[PDB]
C-alpha cells in the first residue's frame, strides 16, 4: 500500500515532530 | 486538414507536409470507399466476388498463354497486370484465405518468370515479400539464394542458403547452391 519514500518521509517527519515538541516544551519552560 | 470532391467520392489531403501514417490512412479510406461503392449491398459479406476473381484468373491465364509461346516479356507484363488488378480492384473484405493463396500463386509464377527473364532485383524483392508474408518453403530459398548469387552479395546469400538447408536438409539444389556460395565467397575473401 505504502511506497518506501513515503515511509522515510513519515519517519523523518515523525522524529522531527518529537524533537520540535521537546523544543516547544523547553522554550515554554524558559519563557514561562 | 482534409476536404474532398463530392462527385468523385474520393478523400484527398490538403497541401501540407502530411505524415506517412496520416497519408496511408487517407489512401486506405480512399480504396475502401471506392470498393464499398462497388459493393452495392446494404449488408456486404466476407465471401469474395466470383466474377472479379474469374476475370483476374482469365487475365492471368493470358499471361500463361504468353508463357507457353516463349514470349517472356508479354507474359511478365500480363502477370504483373493481373497482380495489380488483384491488388487494386479486389475488395479488402474479399476472403483472405482465398486472396492470399491466389496472390502467392500468381506471385510465385511472376517471380519464376522474372528470374528466367533476367530482372533479378525485382524477383529478389518480390520473393522477400513472399517470404515475409509467411509461405516459408525451400522452393522459395532456392530462387532467393540463386538471385543473391546473381546480384553478387555473398554474405546475405550464405545466410539465405543455410536457412534453405534449415528447412529440408535433403534438398539437392540447396546443397549445390551452398557449395557455389562458399566457392565464390572464398573469392570474395581470399
Amino acid at each position: 500500500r505504502v511506497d518506501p519514500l513515503v515511509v522515510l518521509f513519515l519517519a523523518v517527519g515523525f522524529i522531527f515532530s518529537v524533537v520540535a515538541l521537546h523544543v516547544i516544551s523547553k522554550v515554554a519552560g524558559k519563557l514561562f | 486538414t482534409l476536404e474532398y470532391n463530392a462527385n468523385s467520392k474520393l478523400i484527398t489531403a490538403s497541401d501540407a507536409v502530411v505524415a506517412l501514417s496520416t497519408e496511408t490512412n487517407i489512401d486506405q479510406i480512399n480504396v475502401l470507399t471506392t470498393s464499398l461503392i462497388g459493393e452495392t449491398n446494404p449488408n456486404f459479406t466476407p465471401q469474395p466476388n466470383e466474377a472479379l476473381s474469374k476475370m483476374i484468373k482469365g487475365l492471368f491465364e493470358s499471361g500463361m498463354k504468353n508463357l507457353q509461346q516463349k514470349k517472356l516479356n508479354e507474359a511478365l507484363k500480363n502477370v504483373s497486370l493481373a497482380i495489380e488488378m488483384a491488388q487494386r480492384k479486389r475488395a479488402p473484405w474479399e476472403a483472405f484465405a482465398i486472396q492470399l493463396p491466389e496472390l502467392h500463386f500468381m506471385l510465385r509464377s511472376k517471380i519464376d518468370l522474372c528470374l528466367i527473364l533476367g530482372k533479378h532485383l525485382e524477383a529478389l524483392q518480390d520473393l522477400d515479400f513472399l517470404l515475409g508474408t509467411g509461405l516459408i518453403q525451400p522452393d522459395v530459398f532456392v530462387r532467393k539464394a540463386d538471385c543473391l548469387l546473381k546480384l553478387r552479395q555473398w554474405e546475405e546469400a550464405r545466410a539465405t542458403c543455410e536457412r534453405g538447408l534449415a528447412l529440408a536438409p535433403e534438398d539437392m539444389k540447396l546443397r549445390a547452391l551452398l557449395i557455389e556460395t562458399a566457392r565464390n565467397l572464398a573469392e570474395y575473401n581470399g
Binding site: - | L2, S21, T24, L36, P92, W93, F96
Partner: protein, 135 residues
C-alpha cells in the same frame, strides 16, 4: 500516431459538408481495422514486454502505461462497436468478422506496397547501378 481522430474529423465534416453515407461508413472500418491490428499486436507483444519488465530493462512507468493502453484499446474497440451499432441497424455483429478480415488484408496491402520503396532503398544502399533490366 493513429487514425482514431481521423474518423472523428470526417464525423465533424459530416455536419457541414453533406457527405455521402458510404464514405462515413467506410471511414469507420479503418478505425476498426486499426483497433483490431493494435489489439492482436498487443496480445502477441504482451509476453515480450512482460519478459523485459521482469528482466529489468523497460521500466515500470512504461509497464503501467502499457496496462493503460490495453484497457484503452479494449474500451476503444467497444466504442467502435457502439458507433457501428448506431450507424446501421443489424450490422453490429458481421462488422467484427469483416473488421478482422480487412485488418489482415490491409496489413498485406501495406506490406506489398512497400516493396517499391524497399527496392529503391536497396539500390541506394548496395550500389547496384542497375539498368532497365537486371544487373
Amino acid at each position: 500516431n493513429d487514425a482514431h481522430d481521423l474518423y472523428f474529423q470526417i464525423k465533424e465534416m459530416s455536419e457541414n459538408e453533406k457527405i455521402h453515407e458510404k464514405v462515413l461508413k467506410a471511414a469507420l472500418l479503418n478505425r476498426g481495422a486499426e483497433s483490431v491490428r493494435r489489439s492482436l499486436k498487443l496480445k502477441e507483444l504482451a509476453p515480450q514486454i512482460n519478459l523485459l519488465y521482469k528482466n529489468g530493462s523497460i521500466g515500470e512507468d512504461y509497464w503501467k502505461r502499457f496496462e493503460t493502453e490495453v484497457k484503452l484499446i479494449e474500451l476503444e474497440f467497444k466504442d467502435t462497436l457502439q458507433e457501428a451499432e448506431r450507424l446501421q441497424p443489424g450490422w453490429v455483429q458481421l462488422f467484427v468478422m469483416v473488421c478482422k478480415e480487412i485488418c489482415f488484408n490491409q496489413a498485406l496491402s501495406r506490406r506489398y506496397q512497400s516493396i517499391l520503396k524497399r527496392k529503391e532503398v536497396c539500390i541506394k544502399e548496395w550500389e547496384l547501378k542497375i539498368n532497365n533490366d537486371g544487373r
